[PDB]
Amino acid sequence: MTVEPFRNEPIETFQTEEARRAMREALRRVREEFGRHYPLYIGGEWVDTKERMVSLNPSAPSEVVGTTAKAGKAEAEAALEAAWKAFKTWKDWPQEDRSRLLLKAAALMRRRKRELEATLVYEVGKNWVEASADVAEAIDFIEYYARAALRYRYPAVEVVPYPGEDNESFYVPLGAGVVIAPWNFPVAIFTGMIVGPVAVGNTVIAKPAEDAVVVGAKVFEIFHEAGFPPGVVNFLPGVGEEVGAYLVEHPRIRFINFTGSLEVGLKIYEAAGRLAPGQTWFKRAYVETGGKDAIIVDETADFDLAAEGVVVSAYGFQGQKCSAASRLILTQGAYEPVLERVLKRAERLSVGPAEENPDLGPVVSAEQERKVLSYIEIGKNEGQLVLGGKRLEGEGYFIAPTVFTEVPPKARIAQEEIFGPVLSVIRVKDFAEALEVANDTPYGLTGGVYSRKREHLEWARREFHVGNLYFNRKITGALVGVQPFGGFKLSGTNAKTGALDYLRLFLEMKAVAERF
């Protein structure tokens, strides 16, 4: 295989008339398609069920974007049999052949980009640029992992020679595993978690989040068209606590690739440590969980630059990002200048139906709305509400950009992942205290520093204990290949997506010696 060097898929900003025209048509066609039903995909065929999953439009929840079939235990078993049967032959494909299949899937995804973006807009309430970033990231995972997999090809291991012998060490895939995905990046993360393991010869049963089952099905339409052999990838929309747990706990599941809440991640990691009756291996579980991410600004920073980056990081996709700035830690000299600029910028943000390309669409569901509003009530008794803090008028789940200030570092709203448009501002004396506060949470995912002082930046490089750290720019939107993505502490197992190391997680090593 020889292809062009990897480059990231450009993120569309929709500033040209051509881009706006294409997006309007894609939005119109997706809207006109509301109510479509998508079956399961098992062993190379679409398989329907009696029960269904319903996906609502969070900007107008009386509108059904689509429905899917619903996987229970029988369908989970059928998918297991298909995946294990497929693994037996898929594992023996030359890596070049598997990588070409990924490249075909990326080309098909790229040709369906506007459609997939438009589906994100309606199904999970992304504005147009957030939708474009999500799809571009998905394409990047396929392109990146296709190339990275070749770096592991037979026989890839560097060993010490021995007289009179051939010593050959090589990687082999693990088997059939389950991928359990979140609603907040339901094209990007769903795709990445599936194609990485599959690229190197594993087979996958994929369980999309309930709120994002339609866009999950469209990704599977791409996989089917690309021509992955029957059983290699399987699509099981259903209830995580039911069919997801069933697969996690199953003796015949080899690995679990999970991205989602800390609460669920803890249950999955604990279950994966157990030997199910008849199980004949130690399960691998990769769990990438939440964050309570901070941006620190000190008195040497460009305050206008900082305020812009904070607003982007805090409120992009309504704060529903594992990478979102939910804490703003300001040294004494930075406090007033930065807070005033952040408030001025944030009060200008538009909120409305995602199709309108507002600054913020709705949060994803009634239950998410309930949780975010609950945390706002908690926050009112912990810090000082200085902006927003209300549901807005309308059927859609619209919440105003919200700011609390003078927040105690140990307050619930300064410790717990709210996953909505809610920023907690913490005032500290100096940079040392800023780092102490930044580090003092159970999490360790993303972080940022705005500062012109070299010594503060390099100190943070050494001591701001997060897996993805950014200086003088936004802390969201890690690019595949550029910024290996994954955290420390209770932000998960540090499985770095979009990095060469990711694929090693889905391989084991054999060493074979022949004495001549």
Q: Which residues are known binding-site members for L-glutamate?
A: 184, 322-323, 477-478
Query: Binding residue for Na ion (CB under 5 A) from 75, 115, 134, 211?
Result: 211
Interface with a copy of itself, residue 273, by CB under 8 A? yes
Q: If you write DSSP's letter for every residue of 121-140 in order, what string do you get?
A: HHHH---HHHHHHHHHHHHH
Tell me how many residues contact ligand NAP (CB under 6 A): 32
Quick check: is 288 catalytic? Answer: yes
Phi, psi for residue 324 in degrees, rounded to 5: -60, 140
Choice between 49 and 439, CB closer to a copy of itself: 439
In whole angstroms, what is the distance from residue 329 CA to residue 318 CA? 20
- Is the CB of residue 501 less than 8 Å from the CB of residue 155? no
Q: Is residue 55 a contact point for Na ion (CB under 5 A)?
A: yes
Size of the site for a copy of itself (CB under 8 A): 68
- Site residues (CB under 8 A) for a copy of itself, limited to 199-258: none
Residue 315: closest CA among 398, 395, 436, 259 = 398
User: How far is CA 141 from its chain centroid?
Assistant: 11
Q: Is 209 in the site for ligand NAP (CB under 6 A)?
A: yes
Instruction: Decide whether 74 or 164 has the Cβ nearer to a copy of itself.
Output: 164
User: What Å distances lie between residue 405 and 108, 322, 410, 411, 423, CA to CA?
Assistant: 47, 22, 13, 12, 8
CB distance 125 to 318 below 8 Å? yes
Residue in 43, 51, 46, 44 with CA at minimum distance from that of residue 71: 51
By CB under 6 A, what part of segment 260-279 binds ligand NAP?
Answer: 260-261, 264, 267-268
Say how far apart CA 366 and CA 389 lie, in whole Å: 16
In the list 171, 185, 255, 431, the residue contacting ligand NAP (rule: CB under 6 A) is: 185
State which residue, 64 or 479, has the beta carbon closest to a copy of itself: 479
Scan for tokens 């972080």, then name that residue. Answer: 447
Phi, psi of 462 (to 5 degrees): -85, -35
Comparing CB distances to a copy of itself, the nearer of 241 and 508 is: 508
Strand partners, 455: none
Q: Which does 300 bind (CB under 5 to 8 A by kind): Na ion, a copy of itself, ligand NAP, none?
A: none
Binding site for ligand NAP (CB under 6 A): 180-185, 189, 207, 209-210, 239-241, 244-245, 248, 259-261, 264, 267-268, 288-291, 322, 417, 419, 445, 491-492
User: Contact residues for a copy of itself (CB under 8 A)?
Assistant: 6-8, 92, 157-162, 165, 167-169, 266, 269-275, 280-282, 285, 287, 442, 457, 461-462, 466-473, 478-486, 488-490, 492-494, 496, 499-501, 504, 508-516
Interacting residue ranges for Na ion, rule: CB under 5 A: 55-56, 123, 211
What are the catalytic residues? 288
